Design a protein around this ligand. Structure first.
Ligand SMILES: *[C@@H]1O[C@H](CO)[C@@H](O)[C@H](O)[C@H]1NC(C)=O
Lengths: 438, 49
């Protein structure tokens, strides 16, 4: 048999649901979402890091002329200078008064340590959600893991189960993301092929060890002004360090709904938002015929005490009269309250206590014991402790916080002035015929 | 759990009170004032004889 149900997408909060079939006792269905896994699609854009300026030994032509030549190295900057007079520890290296000329070229390359300090800029899209479910029926447990899409049933014991699609899509990831040393940042990294000195992504490479690099970082050579040989270079500060200084907080301290984010797939995990519609198919053999199910008679409630607490602190008692020994299932059909146990032993005239949680002070609802029902009600109070860190609001509030006494107060407050105007019009027409008498 | 009371300051008169918590059976609580003790602060002015 196939049964459909909507469950909140949140870990550690089981959901109880029943299946009704003629001739078969109701079967408890417990559904738990063990862990969420939001894994989006990503395409590496480029990788950047701190760079390092190669300053190769300047070329010098003694007493002759020379010309600059371009090269394919990244940020290559070449410039000639005439009138130079190179000097070294050995003294003069060229000998001609101002005829000699020196050519200086510089370029940039990623520093070796980058091999571990690299930062990769990624583009994200088409977030996909994966849910792991545990289903309990007839004190039998089964596991599965399925994509949220409602067209790819999972495989578990050759059982097909379908989930989703999500009610409202949620994704903490933004179109442009940055990764470095296990940390993820939100940032609009410049597109590959576009560079801006003194900012993130001033050195860009397709791969960490790509021989081909493209990058401009505003290197301008200077005319030598010292006796000995020396090539003076001036350039802007590396952009990667500047981003590092003010990069801001990572995404672990900004993701809503407490998504725990792992880098290597770059996926969020174990966060809650939305409702999952799921259709579960149970084998028929799992069902038990009502003939062998225990028969109960003369059931009733007694609310020993109930506390309108966030945690599961409400108590209840049920009194039953039966004839056969066995186990029968129990449940609360009112969404505002959820029980704790699903099945209980049944005796000839036994009574059993149960634990339940509610999201309203007026705890009034219908509780099904085995195949029978019993309506019953009581009043709960707010708790002394108002902050706790355990599963809360097993059912969301449904504007049911209004108490029965408050309902009665509001009902009695309102009066029928409309009836009074109607009576006024009626007596007015009566007076009208009276005037017709006069 | 914290629970407050007002008791008569007098020895040999036990006071019985309860604590109410949902899901917990009521717990008796007996308070007895074994002996009072009032000590004032003093200074020695002088002595005579
Ligand atoms: C499950 O419940 C049925 C009904 O009482 C019982 O016969 C069966 O032994 C239970 N199975 C386990 C593993 O407890």
């Amino acid at each position: 048999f196939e049964h459909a149900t909507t469950v909140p997408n949140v870990p550690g909060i089981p959901y109880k649901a029943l299946v009704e079939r003629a001739g078969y006792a109701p079967l408890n269905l417990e559904i738990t979402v063990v862990s969420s896994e939001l894994t989006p699609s990503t395409n590496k854009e480029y990788v950047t890091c701190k760079f390092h300026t190669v300053v190769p030994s300047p070329q010098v032509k003694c007493c002759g002329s020379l010309e600059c030549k371009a090269s394919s190295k990244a940020d290559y900057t070449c410039r000639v200078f005439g009138g130079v007079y190179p000097f070294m520890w050995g003294g003069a290296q060229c000998f001609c008064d101002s005829e000699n000329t020196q050519l200086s070229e510089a370029y940039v390359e990623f520093a070796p340590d980058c091999t571990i300090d690299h930062a990769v800029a990624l583009k994200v899209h088409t977030a996909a959600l994966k849910v792991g479910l545990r289903i309990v029926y007839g004190n039998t447990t089964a596991r599965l893991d399925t994509f949220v899409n409602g067209v790819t049933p999972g495989s578990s014991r050759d059982l097909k189960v379908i989930a989703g699609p999500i009610s409202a899509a949620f994704s903490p990831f933004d179109h442009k993301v940055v990764i470095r040393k296990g940390l993820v940042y939100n940032y609009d990294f410049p597109e590959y092929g576009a560079m801006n000195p003194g900012a993130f992504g001033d050195i860009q490479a397709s791969s960490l060890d790509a021989t081909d690099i493209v990058a401009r970082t505003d290197i301008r050579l200077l005319k030598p002004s010292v006796k000995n040989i020396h090539v003076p270079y001036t350039q802007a500060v590396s952009g990667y360090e500047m981003w590092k200084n003010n990069s801001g907080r990572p995404l672990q301290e900004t993701a809503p709904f407490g998504c725990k984010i792992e880098v290597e797939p770059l996926r969020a995990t174990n966060c809650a938002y939305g409702h999952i519609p799921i259709s579960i198919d149970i084998p028929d053999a799992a069902f038990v015929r009502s003939s062998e199910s225990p028969t109960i008679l003369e059931v009733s409630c007694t609310v020993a005490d109930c506390i309108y607490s966030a945690d599961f602190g409400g108590s209840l008692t049920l009194q039953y009269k039966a004839n056969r020994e066995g186990h029968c299932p129990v449940h609360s059909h009112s969404t505002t309250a959820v029980l704790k146990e699903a099945t209980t032993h049944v005796t000839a005239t036994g009574s059993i206590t149960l634990h339940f949680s509610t999201s309203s002070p007026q705890a009034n609802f219908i509780v099904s014991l085995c195949g029978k029902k019993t309506t019953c009600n009581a009043e709960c109070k707010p708790p002394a402790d108002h902050i706790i860190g355990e599963p809360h609001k097993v059912d969301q509030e449904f504007q049911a916080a209004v108490s029965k006494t408050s309902w009665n107060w509001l009902l009695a407050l309102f009066g029928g002035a409309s009836s009074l105007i109607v009576v006024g019009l009626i007596v007015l027409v009566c007076s009208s015929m009276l005037i017709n008498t006069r």
